[PDB]
Design a protein around this nucleic acid. Sequence first.
DNA 1: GCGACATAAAAAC
DNA 2: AGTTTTTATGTCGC
Length: 290
Amino acid sequence: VILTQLNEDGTTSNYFDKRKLKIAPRSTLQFKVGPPFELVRDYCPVVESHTGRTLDLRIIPRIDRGFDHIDEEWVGYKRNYFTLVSTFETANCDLDTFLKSSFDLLVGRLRVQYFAIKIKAKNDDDDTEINLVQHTAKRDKGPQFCPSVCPLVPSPLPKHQTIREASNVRNITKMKKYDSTFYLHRDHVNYEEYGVDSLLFSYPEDSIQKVARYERVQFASSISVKKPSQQNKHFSLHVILGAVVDPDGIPYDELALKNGSKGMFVYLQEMKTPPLIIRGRSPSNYASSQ
DNA sequence: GCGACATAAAAAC
DNA sequence: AGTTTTTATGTCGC
């Protein structure tokens, strides 16, 4: 009925089928590690502007809520939240050095303003994009929004337990405890240590995330979860690492820039999950029907 | 099948 | 120790 796997940090993931077992909304059993991500591809190379050294990049993503491993399928529920977190790392550059340096895209060199992550959902069989929506903790009593592009600096990915613990913090003392895990406050560095052209100082805001945390995420309410044949559709969640550049023949998305103009989010690397099944609102997807 | 509102149970404080 | 918050899901109306 409940199948248990030990996570990397010694917490457990407890996989259960909501058709058969109903668990309380805030039970820790609702937190669990989802499917592992795989490389789709690498895109534009990035080099350090004097040394010419290629920057090694790696996305480090994880799902922490919303998906169960049931009979060799990964299963989510249309009505319920998932959590997708990600960092990236630069194997050949320590953070402190990285932030003082400057980097170009090797297309012929566009200057990188900052690095950022976005997420997408797709139909895994035909590559059609599927809309994602997020809520605040207030859900229907607050606004709905689409996942945003998240500027980030390189960081290790927090353990599953840390993401759990930080999911619904309001208390100022507890917020302070987690601040250094999730944020870099540029306004607190010694500005004299940095050149005008340094990467740190081309990030758009002073508060810079170390971790992209997409919580309270759902597939859009309009998604059809079954094919006409009544077979389940297969979905996939994608994480894309990009370099944001000034636009003034490679994969990119347009982005609302900080100075008002049209920025370009140039793709660097993309990872995706294996195929995902999503259970819809049918009564037969719930233990209450039995 | 979906937008909307109701219930309810453990976390958070 | 009690109150408020958060989120899975139950249900109503079209």
